[model samples]
Target: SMSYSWTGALITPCSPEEEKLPINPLSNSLLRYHNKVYCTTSKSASQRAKKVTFDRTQVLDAHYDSVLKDIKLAASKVSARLLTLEEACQLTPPHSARSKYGFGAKEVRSLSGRAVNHIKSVWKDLLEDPQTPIPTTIMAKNEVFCVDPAKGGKKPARLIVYPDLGVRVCEKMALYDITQKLPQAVMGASYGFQYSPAQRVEYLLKAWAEKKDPMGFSYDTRCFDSTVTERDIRTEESIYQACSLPEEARTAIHSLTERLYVGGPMFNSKGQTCGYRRCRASGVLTTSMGNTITCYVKALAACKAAGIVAPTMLVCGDDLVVISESQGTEEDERNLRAFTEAMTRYSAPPGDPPRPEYDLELITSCSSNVSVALGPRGRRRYYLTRDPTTPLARAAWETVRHSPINSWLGNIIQYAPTIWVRMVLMTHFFSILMVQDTLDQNLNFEMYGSVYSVNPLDLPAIIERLHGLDAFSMHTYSHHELTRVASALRKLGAPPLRVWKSRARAVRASLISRGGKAAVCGRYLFNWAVKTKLKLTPLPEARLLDLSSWFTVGAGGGDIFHSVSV
Candidate 1:
């Protein structure tokens, strides 16, 4: 008998359900594409399928083969020597995941001078007793999952904690090598920008090219990592152990697993010992590692069972895209449903059934949606997207305090020229930079503020270093899409783009007049001057280290307070 269910409604999409929006021009304009921005929740997912059989070689492509080999290679590298305690300590950032011990990340990250002794003393206690579980502190993490006020409301800031200095150093020693290496390998072209944003673009273009031909749709799981059971985490540990490591490092890693990794008590606001936790922490050393391997393993199992061919799949955590053979739209959708069913049997139960969005180019996941927008060079271009809600929701002015950036500005700079940033962030970031008062405010997210000062010049250099040459390049859009973007900004109370152009021009003219490295930097990175652009220079690859750690528990700290609880 052929039957299926999404199975206990376990699937979880990162975005929210569409309810109602404020009745306004912005709402109306944004609503023009409301249905177009859909992502699947378990309720909205499919639950049935028609079985089929096919050969893996059918879907195998050169691209798929290259990624698999590289991923395994990268995984092998993770087996190599893990970092040392001192090495790990050196890698820890100055201000990040502050411990409740009164010594913030500032003291911990301080290398020379006196802070070293404080950090050493803390590390001293950690090393003195190997059997004792190190302590950790819990805190609320504020973030924006959706921009549209109506679509997105306040969400529980994730509660995460880091263990004592000893355990943290081990986490770094255990993770830094693999975290950086494994993600790129396992996910390959499927990593962050590679999957959700960049590869999503290519897939849309490919789908658009094959409009009349059979093409595959996207499938996502509910609460991808949260659904990851203890067994899955153990599997991640297995992957780590399998990697070749020095006896000291590997043994300590196993110790971390037994003493700290498996479980920990969570503290609440009053510093009282609260409920205990048994699942994955969304923020930490193994997040990327655990998520990718689990998602990929479950998906591959489903694929193999459903007679899916050598599926060309890209996985970034749970953000996945698959290219498979299809004969027609209806058949492809059925195949997708079958794919979901197989995943269910494998215990990677989904929140909703896998459904296909053939027309939109790519399926949505992780707050990113695929939309058909006009691109330059007179052709259809599709890209993954999230709304510019965080920047908009924050009440930022000279006196009206802004919300925590949490890299909101950084994302704006990275995704520049995209519909949202061009119209909004350009104005927002530049406006804040231009003001004398805004400069007084701290930029960047994190209580461990840097000795570094916030400079508008930093934006250009950062954009260039992180996003690359494409950051400065232009991508245009169609009238249908552009109008929707335009209306979104106008209705959201953002100043017009022309005003931004003028503001940017003022910054640019200011830079040119400054007459030095600052000017060179300004002229080099500004987007407004594409025609007579300055000579480009690669931003230095500065040494940056892990800002957060995992496991071990401390008494609970203060609770979170915020403007938009949702």
Candidate 2:
């Protein structure tokens, strides 16, 4: 009866000093659900929230058979189309449409929506049984692995579930026994679980709303105590008045553009920035600052050649300490020569490079200061002066450009395959496409059709035939009844086939056991497992071997052993 409880957290505005620095908003946002808290941030709050809602639904609505069928069909169609295109292009005279335009955007959207709705209806009907028990064959106890020193053994299997925490735990104690001695070769595995598409849809919607637009949805403010209410809202007018500045000053203040463009800030322990590292790191600054700077700088240089506004913000954990800008110096010059020179100097070799004639000009033209500090635990802090025209400001930009934390996260997404898969799947299916794609692909057809005439017996034979013919299997079983009934409606169709005879008890039992073993093995290899110990000493030990032996002997093992001894 336990389920995930999602709760939202509030976003806090950075201090003016902090505003001068760069940081990731997504990583900073933390939320509490069930009893645990998870941290995530958003580049686009609206997009992220929408994505979460979409993904949750897709995952929730996923069904094994339908998803497989969808994938198969899509893959086939795509491959076939590509082949057709290749063959067509090979011809001397390439065929082209007389009128190139096909479906318009609105029409395409309408058709797609309708198709998705129809598929969703079918999916809902297939998964409608609220009380349907998950088959034991499909939902085996997750295997647990443990390392115990007391039994002259290292590993054992176990399963643990924490409903309160909304977590499922499994231990795979002796997994190494099978895998450890193998050569340094790659091994892969897969596992699957089924859930109602409707449930998934609901979860996806919730996730999207939370991640994309947390502010739009009502959430508890207690978690984000620093969040300012509308009552405490201060507009530009109020800010100007508070600072005792005139209208011109106020306009300039609002016009005080800044950006925290993410780039290389490759700083050595000696607190020097390097150009190579800066170029390597991809960076982003605070959204508000980035947007404001882009707008302001673009508007300022509209009359002349192309102009760009690149701002850099630097941070360490929650602390934002610097801001940097790359902007045009004069109306005639569109380039940021001064900014580039500062960067070159910051990244120069440890020994000072020969001072160019423009060094003093570059230094004076920029009004920013850079300060670097090294903490006890190898923590480095670089502060850039708030003054927009200082060399320190350029240095601040460099520092944020090559941030280690941000770089690490970027590398993970780039390198980790499982993580990458999850991200892409979640993004496309859940966030962008919503649950429509999943429902269309995964649900059975019974929701749309009234007649059910497909005999379950015909499925295995048909499957075997298809496998033999094409070396592929599909969801022909799902539409068997529909196919049978549809065919019967036609004039020359054969009669509905009868169901297959029920197998004897012994045969059924043997088949079921084999199927269970295969399913369990599949799950063991594919699913992610956590390596942690559980303390369960208070419970009495229950041995599976004792039960097995007793059942085989037709007597309790303890009693049988005692009698034999006597």
Candidate 3:
């Protein structure tokens, strides 16, 4: 039934929150209206709570059951094991919020006797009290979005429901291994987190070309986390249980499913029991995997029900793109309508209705789409790109307020091959960093729940390794992509693409004149700006840099500390 139940208790903030962005010349250059920009605070959680509280019911058919069996069979091939208490502790992020208990992330990460003992006791409780609900702390997720006065300028913060440090660590102990191994094995190409931006583009193109008259559409569920049913959680657990595992691992997995994964009581910052969560908790380790698998299953069933032929789907949580063989333009449209109806009946209704897309670039998912540019030697190369509004807004906010975690850096690293990242984000932030004389200084950024410390100068090498050499030379971006970028810039009150080009040339010249690693950044990252570009050679540092865990988990999970050097 209801996803969440509240007791009229306000979701309070523990500390003072900043509502307005600080005025800074650099941030002002990127985006104006410093007053209009605001961070979502706890004051708005009441609205968010109301929005998320809804009754949910999922309708499934034989197609869903058939796909479920296939997924379980796929999961059976991969054996998952329980993580040791020490391994789980080591995985906790250094900056993760301290628990309601006395132990913090530091104590757990250090394998302190007290932290270890509490974690062990928590795991034991999970096994013993499978029927009792685990308590979770509910916090408001502070995100920056430009205020549009037309749409009620201020939007409420999304609620994050998470268990304590010990329970969080224990959650990892039970499902971390399964999270690492199960989704990819079961979903295969449908697993969206496995692909880099370039690879995603490549896969999409290949999937598109493979079809005989391809038709594509992206499906997004309304409040996807809330739509997750108890049956869905148990189904996800069943898939994990199908995996070959030790007896202890099986018991832990089963107990964890009943106690934590299915549902729990919600606590506010003041330690009051605020609500009860009967749906998927967005902060849990299984959030991404469970959402992806559930979405994939429903999508496959929808495709079957709609008679969609040879569907190639890319699912990232609730975001899904399905490219299948066209029956005809009119037929494709009708089938998509049928698919939407099926998804709605399955309790995964779309925010925007799905329509058939003939162009691969037009069908967006994961907030990005396949875009083309001229590679070196004038050959067309495809890459992934998204609108620059959110990335730029977040970057401007980061420029003004310095923090340990640089989201701009994370955006740059994840979206390196994209046109917006290559042009605007790189140009804007590098200029700011160079001005502050922190280009060589280490900055922390989190990706896939793990944090890493790196210098600005190292970006060139990291980009090359992750996105390949073509990232530097990508030019003459697709018109559709350019239009989106330009529109997004205008919408966000950012400078035009031409202005960014001018600024980039100055930044490029400055970095080149600076020499050393900075020079490498200029030559490689800014090559597209110049007519006479220098040939880019591989940076030796790129080879030494290990990115094994960079794309390991889906984005938006709780913190993870990489104890081993990256």
Candidate 4:
């Protein structure tokens, strides 16, 4: 009879439960090999063989080859001086620096000035040239005359000029820019065109006169036909003929108003009303966009004026509604209602102020009803209102006043919408610099350079090599003994007497060198000395586990761990 220990069966069992069982002796001949012993059980024959085998040699070779390849690839890809995320962040100018020192606002102002100058220069030429065509026309009975004409006829003509209209609109844009300079100005120049003492009375009078009769119309004739009349013909009842003032008088009103607003004295060189009314009566007119341009031109005759090079202006329609369908906070409802009110008011003519009972009361009632209807999640309301008290409303008014002229030019130039353009550019920059940095650091371990290549065929060799190295170095024995000893010592509360003595000695020496408590305290005070010193020194490497052997495998199953001693 043969007595064989079932070592294989006990160590590598058919099932986990079998492996948990005690080792047993087998007398079966079939279970016994040349030196190794097997178990003779019904389950043993049916059990599947283990698929994976352990090796060390091939794994070591493969790992080395992979590391070499990675190093070569990294070398090729990396630049001599690659910029890190921190470096990039430092490179970007701060918001305050950009707002205060950058040329962005100045560039915008310059572009605006250029636009004004371009329009004015073109207009001046148009006003001088009789051949240039004017487009817009309003019919007065059967007659049609240019709403804006290139040049007035030798005799006074009832003709209107688009250049004049363009100038009038552009003047508002100029005033908008000017108001930004003066923080204390109470009234908007645009709104004041109706009733303010400093209003350009001539422009109002001209516009009012044009609205009443228009150009190329005769009061005596039942029907006046402009088509039959010559291009240079003048109407008897035209503003130019009735007023008996030179063309210059009409333009000078804008200049006079600007002078007065910007702290110029009420009296002109002559002792007359130097404001819009008096200037218009005199035969001295300036065809520029606004008086501000002339003021700037006079101030900076030697230096280039802040001119607009680009036609595009950022006009944010804050008056537009953004209503909440669900229950929102009071602030949200208020903002929504305000925006809605602004939009409504903006659509109407500036002269027609929104009625409280019909417009304001209606909007308030509608909004309150909407809030009630939406329960916890209520219907929030939005409407446009032209209330100067609200910033959004004021911004909306300014947008409406300026956007038309700017947008007209933008349409001609095929420029992009300002807000959209800014968002796109900013997003693109942020993505490149910030978003990519975060993704790369979190997702790719290769970014910091540590991963090994493994193949199925090399598994046995690799395991064998690892086993050989472990055996040669006696690492398993050391791990078991050292870990057990360390655990036992920690449990026993064994003090590190030598370490404590060294630390105490160092502290004593430091105290002695410093001479006194004050000196020692000063050294460790709120001066951030440690941080300053650390900043002066090179950055320390990240603390990592001592798996140096696992990082890079050797060609054979030798002591690969020795290669990573540092």
Candidate 5:
């Protein structure tokens, strides 16, 4: 089946979408070339449409079945129950898109009679109709970025295909439990979504050290979701079915699988039948989970086919990094080529063919890699960091366009230990907040698809829990990391690292003089900027913070997260 078939309907925007960044002195101070930053719009959706439409074929082997059996055995240990309507309603994000059937997120969250009644009807329909195609709305996901003129001035927005709000709630009722419990159970340490930056770095380090002569490489699949064949998705379904589930839950799962998961009809914003989807939907409850399982199975099979030994994989959706025992540089390269060929035979072709890497720090997955720096006690410490280009661009965008979901806040929470986050993002946002005298006010941001209300002063404790004490005193970032950060800053017209350091000092002094938790933030988060660092102690609240759900899922997927705790 084709991934997509269109009916000549243009994906139009509901309103006039802004493409240029707004004029704000605060944002301008952080990045000078306001003209270089732009947000994606619907005008580019046609270009994206061409990229996502394709045909896929798969070649399975004994290794694939072996891994599938292992996953099913793991699934048998956990039983997923249907979520009560109230429970599912409470999991809805406050700003989730409204249903086409006259109900929205607030009404769903409150379990209003109208919303509940409609949701019940949708659930009932799911149980009755097993083969009918569920209609989904398709829209362009508007993302902001720094313009790369070489790659065509402004990049097109990726399309988000999803069902209506009522069906979405029903999806949670059917599969929320499985999505939460299954991946970690089956993949174990290889599930990359389950790790925070510090934990991820440590896992990679341990995996690296265990190999006799380590060889690692990251695999990048071109249009991974589109590459998913119907059999692969149904295989994903069989894995879910293997779990111990209630009778009605089993029926719902099967019905949802047949009706919504395998294939569906796509509707545009203007209520036109835009196309039919025969591949993985981006905004479904199963997107991340399904992708992880499918990718892991294929990678494991490919590893076996290529004769990789002691392979340790890290899978986050389509991003994969594998470290294995080396048999000299030449042999490692040949095996990796064989691995790529096996993956291609399975229809998961690479944008760039995989290559063997001898150094752990050279491999990047999920946009991050392991790097080293000096801790307060002058010992080598490994941490996770990525090129700060995207984070810096998003921060510059947030400073001007006021949105409820501040991605900068999410980045700070997720990458708090990174050199760029501590030195630049912290300095930039705090400086902006202090100028507006809103440091005391709580702001809402999203993590793992859930909105969180956080006070700026509470950052110290949050960072401490997520990244331990070294987050405060990590210094002398590796040469490669520092050079990348500096180059990204220059490319984005952002102030150089030295300038951010100077600005951080000012922001630090202001917070210290203000005193209280603000003083705590200044002392702990900015110690690297000062020569005479304050003797640090753990925040009183750090021990009490509940961070269990923070690292449970990837950030941008449409999975609903309800944990309102810090």
Candidate 6:
């Protein structure tokens, strides 16, 4: 058995010896996880990869059905009543060793000792009294890439919070499910393209060429969730209450609004209480959900004001895109200006102004940009990218962690057409795996933590769904793209493309002899065949739902910046 590390709820202060590793450039307070127990990252995965062969249906069934069932069940429960404190508490998972007020994480979950009393009191204070602001403590979040240079060689922790126990339960019952469901339901196909990098590439290439046909832009609001005022949070609360949840659930939510939410004490790492929290807390229960719904509420309204109709758009948190009819330059300019003003009116504005130029050559939304190169057919093919920085950094990181995420196979499958991915990423990943010689083993890795790995091989059927049949097939590359790719490999201390080319041949030949999804994947996704390919398998899915049906369309009170005026 292999011990896997999880991403969420793993935020803990760094032990002194563990503090020296590289951190994220954007977030600077945290250290990367050296957290695996039973198995070291790369060794464990490769060893496991060696032991088991892959079977497409059986491998897919290993995790998908059960997890998907849970998500669907959770999604159906959103409109139902909230959980009672005990019920809510049952949903609480183990946490990083953290203590605040004598009852940290496991204490509340296990109620070990008389911590149940602490839990009781916390809930009583949180629920029975439902009008005051309940501030939350924020912690830094640890991430996957710590030692990589692209992350500024510093492991910066992103700020987050583990809210009160009562809120944690309520979060599981409410916010958490919606986080899984909202984007699945509300945004649906608009943004689900990310699931299929090939489709995303197709969309981008088609979008870029459709210029004067449909105009699009990407805008990101800074700290969109944190900047939301207490009023908006309360409005979120009201929106939840408005759902047809059971009575106890209603009470629990109202309580969350008064004490655990609304506002609370901000705690510093020293265990000392800092200032009182005045706005939405980043590390709390419904943060991602709150961010999405709130942003959508504002963005949808802004689109209305801009007369963009239902606004053909995609949103994954604040990273979003809008592609609507290009009503000529002058009208588009006026509407886009209004789109900015309209968003500001809804409490979300720029740092993200309109960039029509991005829409021209290689427009990007969610780190994906459009670019062109010759396909295996030697016909020109266009694809999406965020340049090579992301995948290159990820490639570099697969070596950094002892419990490394061997996701290059996954990456190559999704972004197979990218120049960086097709050459550099593919070259290096296979070279390492070739030496290790685990190419035929169906290597397994946990995503985040318990979530199944999004191994593209495991879901060839769905890959076919997102990408067209044969879209997952391997593709040979343009000489120019190959040259830059080889250059990057040399700079990064990775094997050159020539080595990768030979290794790929070996890897492909081995897979052809071995059989199963991994082999077929190697043959199709890598340069084994001539063109990238896809299968007939349905796209595997996690819990995602249509939320517009659950949450009602409400007239939330006027937007008030930072001020509490709901």
Predicted structure with the largest lDDT when compared to the true one: 5
lDDT of 2 by residue, 1-566 (tens): 00111123211112111212343222111100111111122222223222212111111112222332332332222110011211211210111111112322222223344433433332243234322211100001111111123543221111111110000000001011111111011100000001111222232233323332111101011111011111111121122223222333233222211100111122221223211110101111111122222212221222111222322221111111111232323421323333223222222111122121211112211121222223223443222211111111222222233321112221111111222112221121111112122211211111100101112212222212211111111112213323433332221111112210011122223323445332221122112121231221211112111222111121100101100000
lDDT of 1 by residue, 1-566 (tens): 11111123222323244322323333232222232222222232222111110111113334334434444565775545666545655555444455554555556555544445655554444344445544444444333333345644333334344465434545676566655455555545444423324455665455445445435555666555445555556656766765666766666666565545554554433455533434454445565556666677666656655665446565656666665555466666666777777665544556566665554424544545555444323445455555554444432221133333345454564355466665455544544454443432435432111112234455555444433445445456545556655665555555556665665666666656766545654565454444465545454521131111210100001111111000
lDDT of 6 at 155: 37
Candidate 2 stretches greater than 4 Å from native: 1-47, 54-398, 401-566
lDDT of each: 0.47, 0.19, 0.82, 0.21, 0.85, 0.48
Using TM-score as the measure, which candidate wins?
A: 5
User: What TM-score would each prediction reach against the true structure?
Assistant: 0.68, 0.13, 0.94, 0.15, 0.96, 0.63
The candidate, 2 or 3, that scores higher on lDDT is: 3
Using lDDT as the yardstick, the better of models 2 and 6 is: 6
Backbone clash tally for model 2? 55
lDDT of 1: 0.47
Judging by lDDT, tell me the better candidate of 5 and 6. Answer: 5
State the displacement of the C-alpha of residue 466, model 5, in Å, after optimal TM-score superposition: 0.7
Off by over 4 Å in 6: 1-12, 16-135, 142-157, 164-169, 179-212, 304-310, 358-361, 370-385, 403-419, 430-451, 454-471, 474-496, 509-522, 525-566
Query: How many Å off is the CA of 293 in candidate 3?
Result: 1.0
Candidates sorted by lDDT, best first: 5, 3, 6, 1, 4, 2
In terms of lDDT, the poorest run of 10 residues in model 1 is 550-559
Candidate 4: where are CA atoms >4 Å away?
1-174, 179-184, 187-360, 363-376, 379-566
Off by over 4 Å in 1: 1-78, 100-102, 112-138, 144-154, 184-188, 193-218, 359-361, 369-385, 394-405, 437-455, 458-475, 517-566
Q: Across residues 429-496, which tens digit of lDDT does each residue of candidate 4 receive?
A: 21222322321121101100111222211221232232211111111212332343334323322222
Residue 523 Cα positional deviation in candidate 3, in Å, after optimal superposition: 2.7
Q: Candidate 6, overall lDDT?
A: 0.48
